[PDB]
Design goal:
Chain A: Its main location: secreted. Chain A: Homotetramer. The structure is a homodimer. Chain A starts with a strand and ends with a strand. Chain A has an eight-stranded antiparallel barrel. Helix content of chain A is about 0%, strand content about 55%. At the A-B interface, strand 4, strand 5, strand 6 and strand 7 of A face strand 4, strand 5, strand 6 and strand 7 of B.
């Protein structure tokens, strides 16, 4: 039980994460969609001492979409919270920013929401 | 890469970052005052081989708002792009999620935008 483990989003992407004692998130992300192939490095942070009132655990992480196979010149950040329970879940909102010219900056950023579970949908 | 160094937003916050050869962003986010109680660990990633057509360099980072002195039970992610030159900028949009109960989850996430420059 906890953040550390292998998670899958509603699209079948694979989020392999370790939550360190210092508040660090490290691991790999493999996307089922987009200009992406195989695993990408991720790093992030999480609240290592969450409230004890029934609230979830805040967290966030980033993937820059460059690996040894492809480079999409873009990065996604997920911001969200881990919710413990019978079926543990990480509920997130995300921003995907692509590198653009100034004239195209208005359309540089996609927004969405991903929910992660330790069971693959 | 032009990213390593100290950046200032439009509201008096400061971050110091190192952009590693491997695409890592590592540093500290603080207030203009810079007292220890206002400093937090920052980590993220950037495109270490951006396009050469005039496009910006995509990047993102996270700060969880816990340090040795306080804990807001929340985390912000900034997603954006670095634009180089004499007037270098990091243009971002951000998401600040607080830990909530499920009944309050609908109001868990704030959204906004920050522009960072190398000058106060």
């Amino acid at each position: 039980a906890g953040i550390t483990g292998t998670w899958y989003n509603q699209l079948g992407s694979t989020f392999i994460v370790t939550a360190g004692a210092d508040g660090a998130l490290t691991g790999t992300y493999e996307s089922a969609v987009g200009n992406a192939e195989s695993r990408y490095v991720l790093t992030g942070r999480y609240d290592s001492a969450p409230a004890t009132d029934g609230s979830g655990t805040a967290l966030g992480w980033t993937v820059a979409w460059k690996n040894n196979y492809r480079n999409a010149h873009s990065a996604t950040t997920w911001s969200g919270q881990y919710v413990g329970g019978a079926e543990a879940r990480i509920n997130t909102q995300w921003l995907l920013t692509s590198g653009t010219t100034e004239a195209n900056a208005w359309k540089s950023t996609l927004v969405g929401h991903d929910t992660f579970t330790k069971v693959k949908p």
